[PDB]
Design a protein around this ligand. Sequence first.
Ligand SMILES: CC(=O)N[C@H]1[C@H]([C@H](O)[C@H](O)CO)O[C@@](O[C@H]2[C@@H](O)[C@@H](CO)O[C@@H](O[C@H]3[C@H](O)[C@@H](O)[C@H](O)O[C@@H]3CO)[C@@H]2O)(C(=O)O)C[C@@H]1O
Lengths: 292, 124
Amino acid sequence: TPSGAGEQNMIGMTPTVIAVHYLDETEQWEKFGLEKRQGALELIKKGYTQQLAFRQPSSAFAAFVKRAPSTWLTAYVVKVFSLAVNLIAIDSQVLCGAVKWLILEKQKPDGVFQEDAPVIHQEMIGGLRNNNEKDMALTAFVLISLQEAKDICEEQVNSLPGSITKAGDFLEANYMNLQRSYTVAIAGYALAQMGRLKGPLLNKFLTTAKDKNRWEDPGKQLYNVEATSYALLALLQLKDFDFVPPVVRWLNEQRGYGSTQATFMVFQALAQYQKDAPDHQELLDVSLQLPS
Amino acid sequence: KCGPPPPIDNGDITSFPLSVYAPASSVEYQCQNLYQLEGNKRITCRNGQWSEPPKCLHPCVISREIMENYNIALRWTAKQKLYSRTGESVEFVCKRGYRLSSRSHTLRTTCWDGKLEYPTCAKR
Ligand SMILES: CC(=O)N[C@H]1[C@H]([C@H](O)[C@H](O)CO)O[C@@](O[C@H]2[C@@H](O)[C@@H](CO)O[C@@H](O[C@H]3[C@H](O)[C@@H](O)[C@H](O)O[C@@H]3CO)[C@@H]2O)(C(=O)O)C[C@@H]1O
């Protein structure tokens, strides 16, 4: 066990939250063992409660009490807690306080989100660990988390929709210059979610894929799994079910250290694919993520 | 007794909102990073009514785009982009061998509310 628990606890929360989500969304609890749901819910509660000890007076999070808070970690907390809101009781002040800190403290005038205190455990951030296009990649990552929180917090936090819009403008204004498939996939999901992916941008998003079935860049393949998952989420937003089956097959065929993001994103994307797509293909195994 | 506090652009209140506020009670605003509160940061529940709320003055964004033009580049640092608060100054010199063709002072300016007037330096 590595030491900075504000981060490590989130690494450990991740498998359970996304497994439960997957099984809820695809309604596959009967097959897996419906008896095991209550136990998983309590494990999620215990992750959430443990994370609270790393919540700073500012409502931001960091690996330790006296480390500066991380923008990335605070946004990953918002995303994970948001998937759990109807799984356990998540205090809105915790979730929407973290959202407000992002908006008030870490967003730059042109919409960019900035990281002033990177996470210690860089393996937990997946393909963000790249240094080109970090403004776009991170801004997309944070905006995706803001999108998840919009309906819980729009009331508690009035500045949220405009900060959302301002992040989208920045993504839209720079999307065409992008070179890396990872950024194209992650920013493309972020834009698609807001319906703001179209014209040359949509074309660029779709034509960036290889073999009409993956988004990839030279490097750790775990980053391409995570990229393609975003891409699959962007396609589901677009309702482009024609483009989807080869993507799903390539992802399904890709069944560790540094796999928090791959795991989170594959299970999210494949859950939504089965939830949304008419006569979807038969799909992988959740007990790895959720043992007993 | 007042309802929820009004919104302001590029800012929000420093506490969590409630549905009804007893009179006498105040809340403060804060602007987003690099935005400048104009007016009183605090409002009060005045006979079932909010007192007046502040403005947030825009910073000024200095792009690689704007740079390539007026033929000025960054005097001290070499960042291809820079943000300036209202009430704060930036400083350029001219591009690849030009003269100052604007006013008898303008290389040093005051970003105010998103407005910043660039010096122009013309070719040769
Ligand atoms: C928005 C912003 O960043 N405002 C800063 C600016 C900008 O960073 C800069 O002007 C852009 O090129 O810097 C300011 O401080 C400088 C100012 O006091 C000048 C006075 O002419 O001196 C600079 O320090 C110099 C020093 O004077 C030199 O002798 C030395 O060779 O180098 C030093 C640093 O390189 C200050 O940086 C500014 O007003 O321009 C302060 C703004 O708030």
